[PDB]
């Protein structure tokens, strides 16, 4: 009779953490993150204001998640597309937390996992399309469909 | 000057059946033109894919904010009040037809309007205008209003909804509150979160959200009330009205423990009004006891 | 001008380097001396082949080990070719000078001789344990001399007047005070067995037991040098038993050779039963050993074979592999990848061949089915070939298992996918609610009732061009008719309000409530989203000791509740909801049904006591045991 | 007569052995050359200490690397002491001749000099990748000569007249056609980072991008400084450079060992556990071994046990004997002594960190699994590790508490520590096993991880007091004589019901007895003193690689304990007395057993039976 031991398969994951500025500027990342999102450290920190990395279709989704994080202190699991150095779009599943130095937020730590195209497309298909408090059928997507965009994305 | 001479050179050929009445309107940036339309295929099959006046469904139109489709705006430009006309359009203008009639009729996989997706061709357009008004006379609808003017128009919707509620109508009051809430929430997007202006915008939405919750409660729709009251409480946790409404909704859906806790929080936060909460608790207890007695009946000799 | 010089060497520090920095293990001195003795015996045998008169001073070719505890000396005697005085001075007195290498170059081409030793420094390892070394030699055409040295920069050669050795050499080591352990029987046996087990001459050991009991150490021959077609299964079994110390024969054997720039021979065995410590991490993987010219070099160490094939016992022998100065590792270790590729290919071929004999493959699968699935989980290059070795129980099979190929052959014309269910046990999966409609329609379901099975199906996306579909996941597609489609649409329309109400009641417990396409007799069931862990996988993952709890949110799937339109309870629920949606009985029944489905689908409750209390309340119920400001507060603002 | 001879050497074969059998990695040639340059710089620096006029041909001591892809040559220029014609011949033309060793042995005692190189064969590693080698050198008291060779048995020395070098040496390698990967920036950077990171002089790489000169070793080896003269800012900078981590370190331990075995160590604790901490596919490189600031090998589980794999640090020595390749330690057994010291000091650091409540909170949140794994695996330090454990308790609320705090609050009559292992905190807190124990005011430890289940198998006692599970049979609680008489009365009263129930559930259980731990629940399932618990059985059934073909002989037996004070049990006794062969009692007993089994952590062999029972009850309730 074999006594209880700790035999384990030891699966391998691909989750990695990153550090961001309050505008979601990537400053610091894991090695796995670099191998997923090919980017030199010098380039990454000196690229944009964070939202320049997001696919256009997910921009409002990510803005809403960002507001949710600022309010509750952390945005739940979200799925969207990142712009790699190769001008590619890869699906990620991310959760972002807000850290406060002294009563005020200091930086954001993001834990994300890379996704395949099929899974990302399925998640996008299931994404909610009706806001809780929209303005009913005003044909806003037809008449104007041109909003200034939320201020949360504004620089600084 | 001569807009028909411009239209004919533009590539659109039209004919007038019955001229309109009055004077040509400015049709500046932002003008409403309520009119009917009846689109039928020019020569490919000759049938009618879409219709507006056939069943009496005018098409409310505002002239030129963006209106991705340019054809309709130009079509309505060259008419006056009470004018009816018919004409065709080139494939280059309506090449994006599937993006227009996809939901404008359903919301109120089409086999008629989708024929152009495979064989674009000329399409006839039978317009019939009734009224054409510049902004300022008719009541602008909330979506197309400007932030500056809506910041001052919001209280009017609030008071109208309140009057509708007192007068004895809730669905219309609920819609008024919903529209005011949408206007207020959209405004918050223009400011940074947590800023004093953001909080100021957030203070005047709580009364409207509470009124909307009350209106929903009278309609016997308790889960929405639960969601909205929970949303209020997660951020304020000090509103006696929010706690009272949440407890009432919980008691309605047989959430005994949560209703009791909410009423207890109401008591320990604003002890002034005891008897109302006591009556609510006693009514909930009587309902629970009656249901327990009834279940005792259901569950009897279930084994023997 | 341009001066020219020849490279020199400083002898004292060279000897110090050889004695102190070449070999990490001191026991390898015996290996080197035995290698030298075997080389000498090879030389004398080759010479005598053409000139039989050379074997007149002795006809037996053998090696002896003679410990002398009293004198603290170890003697290795061989009857090889011996050395002359000039040979002594040159070969033993010159560092990096090899007589074996020169002998090989002086030899003809196409000679059936393979000798160890080409560096010319191995002999000096004797000073790892010996303070003084004496070598007495006797060549055929020369006298008997004695060679002595302490590795102090000089050596003496003199004629020896002692016991006349007929022919060969005799190395006497005067051991150091702190190296006396090598005069012990068990230590010598261990070293000889580890390093010089396949020497081509009988290594005899002489001990005092009085009389001199002889303990022969070379009993087993290196059978892998013979042609595979001239070996019977009995000799294979005897060699395997000697190699593994097993009381039962082998199950299968694969004997092959490789030729070219990389040439080697291999002999791979499959044990009849798995060892109890097969998967233990702290288990040195000496299952396969590497030999060069029949001398042990190194163990497998997961480099000669993948981790999931660690149950294979065998030997890999080569003739031309470049070794480093110590003879315990290869130079340019990238060669090990090619040998691994060849071995894996041949092991898969052996597995495929064994599959034709049904009973033998039954035993093999019972023993090592885990390893195949671990390989499928780990290895992607051989994933397709490994998947053809899997055997499973099915709903349409009896006590016997079947392969996926037999399943695909027996598939229906309208069927497009292989259906499988993973669960705790065969009884649980067979009687589950997920397989009701599938089994009723006549389709076949593969039963997967091992924790390892969950790891395997994560990588086996398809087989034979047909995808594998789990019956416990949402979006199960089955072939149907137009009547079935219309009936399903009718049911969807009829039950929409009930589904909305149940979703309202179970808001955060589930993600969606829908009409089932796989239920017959059950009222409902819970299925997971297409992406993420199933119920069984979630159960297995949460029970892992070395699991990171901070990342379960990224892997868990969402739950969908599916209700059966044809069940009486669902019909009564629809009627009650139509009559009064806020009915307390409806809400209680919905919660109870959800809990029951959650427990019956492989999930676990966050608080089982709530379910227990509900049941106890039901049991007790069955047994019979038990001002003007009011308007102002909720009118406006 | 006795003849005497000296030992000789065959030069050509010796060179062949050096070039073909000493080093298995061709990239170590750059390590050898950089070590030689560092030795030369050390030699010149030492000489100028007592005679500053030596540094007249140049004051800066540096190393330069200059690839030449056009010429296919690699140049290493160092500003060391240089060598004369005689030094050239003797040192660079004699195998196993070391001028560095002679330099050391000529010095006095107590010299602040520690130089790599004592074998006199390293330089010939250049012929691993080079067809021809040219060495330009210039000593202070000599001329500038050129040394050339192809390692073919001879070398040429000539007076060089090309562009002069003020002082030092210049090694020019003519690379082979198949070894041009070392003319690339990435490869050279990778090699120098791996092997010569902590050389004591700047190393500059020159590339054509104007030429771009980039220093390659920007981090000093701070482990040589006094531990009490280092601030936390520079500790953190060194940790970030060493681990490539965007965050600082949680704690550091800097110590030295003196004697026959001397080394210095610098060990760090990260702030967050890595996501691949227990991943099988990764080299054990968390702790690296250095000899005289030159990398030797990785931890490879020999310098530190497996459960301390999260520790990042450096171990440096001076007098560890190496093998010829300088890639391992002759008599490597030394690494077992070093491991003992490292484990001792790591436990010391863990104990010191505990005094800081919040830092230890972070540390425990990150690496509590490692401590329990160490308790399970390690027996020498099991007692010390157990004092580091923290648990949620029925009396600690949100915060976690230690076992010493539990003993401090221990009641006078209490003699044991009570614990429960379960799936989660919610499940155990509301369990039926802890009802009476919590009612009496006793304290129960909550253990909600599988690793906790593995840990309690080795932690039999603590501070002299044994740990007792509340889910096992024979739970002994302190009591009063009234309790004994009441329990005897209850046993006598329910003797018949227990017999009837054991008859109804034949072979499903072994015993039915009156519970001494229930308050509100009507019954519960407990396991026998011998065998696995419910949680243990759950964890063992989920091991993919474990062979569970014999688990039937390891599972514990289950006893059903009923609560005499519950209304359901009293009604059951009355019904059984009225009629034993009733079907209602049988069905109710079976339903109770299933509910208790599901509530005790077990799983049914067929949940569909329970589901069908519930569905039948629902149908009867609805009238169908
Ligand atoms: N027992 C022996 N009989 C004959 N010749 C020997 C014996 N032992 C050593 N020699 C000779 O002395 C030399 C010692 O060098 P060694 O380190 O053994 O080199 P090799 O790698 O060729 O074995 C060998 O080349 C071999 O020719
Ligand atoms: N760059 C250099 N400057 C001065 N002397 C050198 C240099 N490189 C090598 N030497 C001399 O050549 C000798 C041989 O070096 P090597 O064979 O690498 O091993 P070791 O450094 O142990 O001597 C050294 O002892 C040293 O005196
Ligand atoms: C690289 C670059 C940008 C972003 C990123 C990684 C990850 C994000 C994860 C969550 C998230 C939530 C709301 C707004 C975001 C905006 C930008 C990014 C992210 C956001
Ligand atoms: O006998 Mo050697 O010197 O190891 O080839
Ligand atoms: O520089 Mo050496 O010859 O490796 O000690
Ligand atoms: Mg030899
Ligand atoms: Mg050197």
Q: What is the residue-wise DSSP string for D126-186?
A: GGGTEEEEEEEEE-TTS-EEEEEE-SSSEEEEEE--SS--SSEEEEEEEE-TT-GGGGSHH
* Integer Cα distance of C526 and C602 in angstroms: 9
Dihedral pair phi/psi, residue D241, rounded to 5°: -65, -40
* Integer Cα distance of A32 and A36 in angstroms: 6
* Integer Cα distance of C244 and B228 in angstroms: 73
Residue A111 in domain: yes
Residue A89 in domain: yes
- Measured between its terminal Cα atoms, the distance across chain C in Å is 110
**Domain positions in chain B:** 3-133, 142-299
Cβ C294 vs Cβ C203: under 8 Å: no
The DSSP bridge partners found for residue D469 are D419
* Integer Cα distance of C290 and C273 in angstroms: 24
For the domain spanning B142-299, the CATH number is: 1.25.40.10
- Tokens standing for D166? 């003020």
Beta-sheet strands, E only, within D47-151: 63-68, 73-78, 94-95, 130-138, 144-149
- Which residue do the tokens 């099959």 mark? B45
- Tokens standing for A137? 């059928």
Q: How many CB atoms lie within 10 A of CB C478?
A: 18
C123 labelled ligand-binding: yes
Burial class (CB in 10 A: 0-12, 13-18, 19+), C508: exposed
**D328 and D205 both lie in a single domain:** no
Last residue of a domain, one of D162, D195, D218: D218
Chain C residue with minimum CA distance to A6: C545
Residue A42 in domain: yes
* Integer Cα distance of B4 and B2 in angstroms: 6
- Tokens standing for D412? 């006078």
Cβ D517 vs Cβ D475: under 8 Å: yes
Q: How many CB atoms lie within 10 A of CB C70?
A: 8
The DSSP bridge partners found for residue C175 are C130
Chains that touch D (3 or more CB pairs under 8 A): A, B, C
- Which residue do the tokens 């009272």 mark? B244
Which DSSP string do the residues of D339-394 spell out, in sequence order? HHHHHHHHHHHHHHHHTSHHHHHHHHHHHHHHHHHHHHH-STTHHHHHTT--BEET
Residue A10 in domain: no
CATH number of the domain where residue A28 is located: 3.30.450.20
Last residue of a domain, one of C324, C359, C381: C381
Cβ D287 vs Cβ D313: under 8 Å: yes
| Full residue range of the structural domain in which residue D269 is found | 219-380
Nearest alpha carbon to residue D235 among D254, D212, D218: D254
**C373 and C409 both lie in a single domain:** no
The DSSP bridge partners found for residue D518 are none
Residue C618 in 3-state DSSP? helix
* Integer Cα distance of C218 and B248 in angstroms: 93
Beta-sheet strands, E only, within chain A: 16-20, 26-29, 74-83, 89-100, 105-115
Last residue of a domain, one of C336, C351, C381: C381
Residue A127 in domain: no
Q: How many CB atoms lie within 10 A of CB B289?
A: 10
CB contact under 8 A, C621 and B162: no
* Integer Cα distance of D121 and C13 in angstroms: 11
Beta-sheet strands, E only, within C236-302: 252-258, 264-270, 288-292, 295-299
The CA dihedral of D277, D283, D287, D290, to the nearest 10 degrees, is: -170
Q: Which residues of B197-215 are buried (b: 16+ CB within 10 A; e: fewer)?
A: ebeebbeebbebbbbbbbb
Gyration radius of chain D's alpha carbons: 37
Answer whether C565 contacts ligand 4 (Cβ < 6 A): no
DSSP H or E stretch at residue C3: strand C2-6
A105 to chain B, any CB pair closer than 8 A? The answer is no
Cα D148 versus chain centre, distance? 48
DSSP H or E stretch at residue D617: helix D607-622
| Chain C: closest CA distance from residue B170 (Å) | 12
- Measured between its terminal Cα atoms, the distance across chain B in Å is 96
Nearest alpha carbon to residue C445 among C411, C485, C473, C479: C411
| Chain A: closest CA distance from residue C280 (Å) | 7
CB contact under 8 A, C554 and A113: yes
The DSSP bridge partners found for residue A79 are A93
CB contact under 8 A, C630 and B273: yes
Chain B residue with minimum CA distance to C626: B296
Burial class (CB in 10 A: 0-12, 13-18, 19+), C423: buried
Cβ A118 vs Cβ B160: under 8 Å: no
- Which residue do the tokens 């011949």 mark? D89
- Which residue do the tokens 């069940």 mark? C567
**D43 and D126 both lie in a single domain:** yes
Ligand 1 site-directed mutation target among C81, C84, C91, C125, most atoms within 8 Å of CB: C91
Between CA C433 and CA C437, with CA C435 as vertex, the angle to 5 degrees is 95
**No. of helices (H) and no. of strands (E), chain A:** 4, 5
- Residue from the list B62, B66, B181 with its beta carbon closest to the beta carbon of A133: B181
**D205 and D230 both lie in a single domain:** no
Q: In terms of DSSP H, where are the helices of B32-106?
A: 71-77
- Tokens standing for B42? 């020019």
| Full residue range of the structural domain in which residue A89 is found | 16-117+136-153
**C212 and C259 both lie in a single domain:** no
Cα D552 versus chain centre, distance? 36
Cβ D374 vs Cβ D308: under 8 Å: yes
- Tokens standing for C247? 């009381």
Cα B162 versus chain centre, distance? 18
Interface test with D, best of A6, A19, A35 (most D CBs within 10 A): A6
Q: Which atom of ligand 2 is nearest to the CA of D169?
A: 1
- Tokens standing for A33? 């993150």
Taking every pair of C-alpha atoms in chain D, what is the biggest distance, in angstroms? Answer: 122
DSSP H or E stretch at residue D549: none
Beta-sheet strands, E only, within D450-600: 461-462, 465-469, 511-514, 523-527, 558-562
What is the DSSP code (8-state) at residue D309?
T
Q: How far is CA D498 from CA C616, C619, D504, in A?
A: 20, 20, 10
What is the pairing mode between strands D263-270 and D249-257?
antiparallel
* Integer Cα distance of C332 and C327 in angstroms: 13
Cβ D189 vs Cβ D197: under 8 Å: no
Beta carbons within 8 Å of C315's beta carbon, 6+ residues apart: C222, C224, C243, C266, C267, C288, C289, C291
Which DSSP string do the residues of C46-81 spell out, in sequence order? HHHHH-GGGTTS-S---EEEEEETTTTEEEEEE-S-
- Residue from the list D272, D280, D553 with its beta carbon closest to the beta carbon of A1: D553
Cβ B174 vs Cβ B213: under 8 Å: no
- Tokens standing for D113? 């000099």
For the domain spanning B3-133, the CATH number is: 3.10.50.40
**D254 and D169 both lie in a single domain:** no
Percentages helix, strand, coil for chain A (3-state, rounded to 5) are 30, 30, 45
**C416 and C361 both lie in a single domain:** no
- Residue from the list C582, C624, C630 with its beta carbon closest to the beta carbon of B276: C630
D78 labelled ligand-binding: yes
Q: In terms of DSSP H, where are the helices of C379-473?
A: 383-387, 404-409, 426-430, 436-440, 451-457
C551 to chain A: which residues are within 8 Å by CB? 13, 15, 111, 113
Structural domain count of chain D: 3
* Integer Cα distance of B65 and B80 in angstroms: 20
Contacts of residues D248-251 at CB distance under 8 Å and 24 or more positions apart, as own/partner, are D250/D353, D250/D359, D250/D362, D250/D363, D250/D366, D251/D349, D251/D352, D251/D353, D251/D359, D251/D363
- Which residue do the tokens 């807009």 mark? B3
Burial class (CB in 10 A: 0-12, 13-18, 19+), B42: middle
Cβ D376 vs Cβ D429: under 8 Å: no
Answer whether A80 contacts ligand 3 (Cβ < 6 A): no
- Measured between its terminal Cα atoms, the distance across chain A in Å is 65
Cβ C377 vs Cβ C459: under 8 Å: yes
Chains that touch A (3 or more CB pairs under 8 A): B, C, D
What is the DSSP code (8-state) at residue C293?
T
Nearest alpha carbon to residue B63 among B169, B8, B144: B144
* Integer Cα distance of C219 and C216 in angstroms: 7
- Alpha-carbon torsion C448, C454, C459, C462, what sign? positive
**C331 and C377 both lie in a single domain:** yes
Nearest alpha carbon to residue D487 among D500, D499, D476, D501: D476
Q: How was this structure determined?
A: cryo-EM
Cβ D373 vs Cβ D305: under 8 Å: no
Residue B39 in 3-state DSSP? strand
The DSSP bridge partners found for residue B125 are B39, B87
* Integer Cα distance of B125 and B15 in angstroms: 11
**C213 and C225 both lie in a single domain:** no
Structural domain count of chain A: 1
Q: How many CB atoms lie within 10 A of CB D589?
A: 22
């Amino acid at each position: 009779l074999q006594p209880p031991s700790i035999l384990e398969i030891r699966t391998k994951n691909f989750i990695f953490r990153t550090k961001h500025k309050l505008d979601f500027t990537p400053i610091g990342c894991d090695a796995k993150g670099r191998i997923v999102l090919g980017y030199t450290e010098a380039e990454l920190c000196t690229r944009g204001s964070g939202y320049q990395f997001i696919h256009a279709a997910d921009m409002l989704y990510c803005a809403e998640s960002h507001i949710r994080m600022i309010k509750t202190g952390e945005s739940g699991m979200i799925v969207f597309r990142l712009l790699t150095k190769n001008n590619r779009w890869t699906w990620v599943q991310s959760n972002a937390r807000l850290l406060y130095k002294n009563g005020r937020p200091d930086y954001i730590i993001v834990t994300q996992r890379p996704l395949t195209d099929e899974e990302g497309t399925e998640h996008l298909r299931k994404r909610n399309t009706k806001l809780p408090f929209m303005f009913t059928t005003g044909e806003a997507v037809l008449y104007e469909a041109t909003n200034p965009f939320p201020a949360i994305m504004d620089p600084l | 000057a001569d807009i028909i001479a411009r239209l004919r050179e533009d590539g659109i050929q039209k004919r007038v059946i019955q001229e309109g009445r009055g004077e040509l309107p400015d049709f500046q940036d932002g003008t409403k033109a309520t009119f009917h339309y009846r689109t039928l295929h020019s020569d490919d099959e000759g049938t009618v894919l879409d219709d507006s006046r056939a069943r009496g469904k005018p098409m409310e139109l505002i002239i030129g904010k963006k209106f991705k489709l340019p054809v309709w705006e130009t079509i309505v430009c060259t008419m006056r009040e009470g004018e009816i006309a018919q004409f065709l359009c080139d494939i280059k203008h309506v090449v994006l037809y599937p993006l227009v009639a996809k939901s404008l009729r359903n919301i109120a996989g089409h086999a008629d309007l989708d024929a152009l997706q495979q064989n674009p061709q000329p399409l006839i357009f039978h317009m019939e205008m009734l009224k054409v008004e510049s902004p300022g006379t008719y009541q602008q609808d909330p979506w197309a209003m400007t932030d500056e003017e809506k910041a001052k128009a919001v209280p009017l919707i609030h008071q109208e909804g309140n009057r509708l509620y007192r007068e004895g109508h809730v669905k219309e009051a609920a819609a008024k509150y919903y529209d005011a809430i949408a206007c207020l929430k959209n405004l918050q997007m223009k400011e940074q979160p947590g800023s004093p202006e953001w909080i100021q915008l957030d203070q005047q939405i709580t009364p409207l959200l509470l009124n909307y919750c009350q209106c929903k409660l009278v309609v016997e729709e308790y889960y929405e009330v639960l969601d909205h009251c929970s949303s209020i409480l997660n951020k304020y946790d000090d509103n006696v009205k929010a706690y009272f409404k949440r407890g009432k909704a919980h008691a309605a859906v047989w959430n005994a423990q949560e209703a009791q806790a909410d009423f207890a929080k109401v008591l320990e936060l604003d002890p002034a009004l005891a008897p109302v909460v006591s009556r609510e608790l006693q009514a909930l207890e009587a309902r629970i006891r009656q249901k327990d007695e009834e279940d005792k009946a259901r569950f009897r000799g279930i084994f023997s | 001008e341009v001066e020219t010089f020849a490279f020199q060497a400083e002898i004292a520090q060279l000897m110090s380097l050889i004695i102190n920095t070449f070999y990490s293990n001191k026991e390898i001195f015996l290996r080197e001396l035995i290698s030298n003795a075997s080389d000498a015996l090879d030389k004398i045998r080759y010479e005598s082949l053409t000139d039989p008169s050379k074997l007149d001073s002795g006809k037996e070719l053998k090696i002896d080990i003679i410990p002398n505890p009293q004198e603290r000396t170890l003697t290795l005697v061989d009857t090889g070719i011996g050395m002359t005085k000039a040979d002594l001075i040159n070969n033993l007195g010159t560092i990096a000078k090899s007589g074996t290498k020169a002998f090989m170059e002086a030899l003809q081409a196409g000679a059936d001789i393979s000798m160890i030793g080409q560096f010319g420094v191995g002999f000096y390892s004797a000073y790892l344990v010996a303070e003084k070394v004496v070598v007495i030699t006797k060549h055929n055409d020369d006298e008997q001399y004695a060679w002595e040295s302490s590795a102090g920069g000089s050596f003496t050669v003199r004629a020896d007047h002692g016991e006349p050795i007929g022919r060969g050499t005799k190395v006497i080591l005067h051991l150091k005070e702190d190296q006396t352990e090598y005069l012990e029987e068990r230590r010598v046996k261990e070293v000889v067995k580890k390093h010089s087990q396949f020497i081509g001459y009988p290594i005899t050991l002489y001990l005092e037991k009085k009389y001199i009991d002889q303990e022969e150490l070379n009993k087993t021959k290196p059978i892998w040098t013979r042609n595979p077609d001239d070996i019977t299964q009995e000799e294979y079994g005897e060699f395997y038993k000697s190699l593994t110390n097993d009381w039962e024969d082998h199950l299968a054997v694969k004997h092959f050779s490789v030729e070219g720039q990389l040439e080697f021979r291999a002999l791979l065995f499959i044990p009849r039963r798995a060892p109890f410590d097969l998967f233990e991490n702290k288990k040195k993987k000496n299952n396969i050993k590497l030999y060069v010219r029949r001398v042990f070099i190194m163990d497998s160490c997961d480099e000669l074979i993948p981790e999931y094939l660690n149950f294979i016992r065998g030997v890999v022998d080569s003739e031309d592999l470049p070794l480093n100065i110590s003879r315990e590792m290869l130079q340019q270790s990238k060669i090990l990848k090619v040998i691994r590729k060849n071995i894996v290919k041949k092991c898969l071929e052996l597995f495929s061949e064994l599959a034709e004999d049904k009973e033998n493959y039954k035993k093999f699968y019972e023993a090592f089915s885990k390893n195949l699935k671990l390989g499928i989980h780990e290895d992607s290059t051989n994933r397709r070939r490994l998947s053809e070795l899997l055997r499973y129980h099915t709903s349409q099979s009896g006590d016997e298992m079947t392969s996926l190929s037999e399943y695909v052959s027996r598939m229906k014309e309208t069927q497009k996918s292989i259906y499988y269910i993973t669960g705790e046990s065969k009884e649980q999966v067979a009687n589950s609610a997920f397989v009701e409609r599938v089994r009723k329609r006549g389709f076949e379901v593969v039963y997967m009732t091992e924790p390892i099975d969950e790891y395997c199906v994560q990588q086996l996306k398809e087989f034979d061009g047909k995808s594998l579909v789990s019956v416990t996941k949402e979006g199960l597609e089955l072939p149907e008719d137009e009547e079935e489609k219309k009936k399903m649409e009718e049911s969807k329309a009829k039950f929409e309000n009930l589904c909305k109400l149940m979703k309202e009641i179970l808001d955060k417990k589930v993600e969606k409530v829908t009409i089932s396409n796989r239920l017959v007799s059950s009222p409902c069931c819970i299925v997971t989203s297409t992406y993420g862990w199933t119920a069984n996988m979630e159960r297995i993952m949460k029970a892992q000791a070395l699991r990171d709890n901070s990342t379960m949110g990224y892997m868990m799937a969402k739950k969908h509740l599916e209700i059966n339109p044809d069940h009486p309870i669902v019909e009564t629920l629809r009627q009650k909801a139509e009559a009064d949606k806020n009915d307390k009985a409806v809400k209680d029944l919905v919660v109870l049904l959800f809990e029951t489905a959650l427990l019956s689908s492989g999930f676990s409750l966050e608080d089982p006591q709530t379910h227990s209390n509900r049941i106890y309340r039901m049991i007790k119920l069955g047994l019979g045991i038990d001002d003007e400001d009011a308007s102002r507060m909720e009118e406006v603002d």
